[model samples]
Target: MGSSHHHHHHSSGLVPRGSHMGSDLEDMKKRLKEIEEEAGALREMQAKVEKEMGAVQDSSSTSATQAEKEEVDSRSIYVGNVDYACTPEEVQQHFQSCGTVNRVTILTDKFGQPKGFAYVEFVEIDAVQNALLLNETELHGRQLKVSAKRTNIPG
Candidate 1:
């Protein structure tokens, strides 16, 4: 006679509750006010940064191409040690903590192979300095080497 046993799957029924379910309504209202104030401060900072960038652009209006390139260089950060399997979206996400990432420029060889490095562009020039603070930060098991991108003159 073959030994037979019944296999049963048991469901541990558990319900999750909001972590702050016990918080008083007054406390929640206070937290909402704090968030509103923080949002207002962020808007003010953005407007200031925009005005600064506008001034720079206005001063360099003579050569559009050179001006645009300089503007990009001012806001771009060089990233190295990028994983071969990493995607551009991942790089943007990694740098999103610093500021609004405008673009991710991944270097590729003539054959379209990744160069294990890239450039991260931020909308705010202030973000370049903030991104530099993340230099040597690890991503995907590799520590990134971050710095401001210098103008590269092709030979």
Candidate 2:
């Protein structure tokens, strides 16, 4: 494998109540929601562009990129244009609010840096749709490009 790797992490921390930090956390949540919307729009545009690319692309490469352009109806959700700093745990946390997330996979480069995208699979297929409604949600500072993941994941 290349530097592209994924991990399962657990989140643990507790903040005091009735403090400025509490309010700030809420503020951050709202801001993240705003960013998420922007990201979703960007994601839609990217999908449109990729479709155009598919049209222009010459066949025979048999690569994942061209093939992945076709979307599928499944429990898998695709997220793109994500902030490189975003982590698997954060991703899980984000989707878990609306539904149960089964897995998180962040695509990385040879340097083990995020390729600005990832895949999140929900336990219930309908949960994917819930996630879809949250498209354009922000993770980290970047607006995410989210949609139904078109490819399959291996165990």
Using TM-score as the measure, the top candidate is 1
Off by over 4 Å in 2: 1-73, 110-116, 150-155
Error of 1 at 118 (Å): 0.9
Q: What is candidate 2's CA lDDT for residue 35?
A: 32
Quantify all predictions' global Cα lDDT against the true fold.
0.60, 0.57
Q: Model 2, 14-55: lDDT tens per residue?
A: 541211110111243333344332123434466565565665
List TM-score per model, in order: 0.48, 0.44
- Top-lDDT candidate index: 1
* lDDT of candidate model 2 versus the reference: 0.57
* Model 1 ranges off by over 4 Å: 1-69, 108-114, 152-155
Q: Per-residue CA lDDT of candidate 1, range 53-121, in tens?
A: 676444333343344446656678888766766677777777777755655768754455435578876
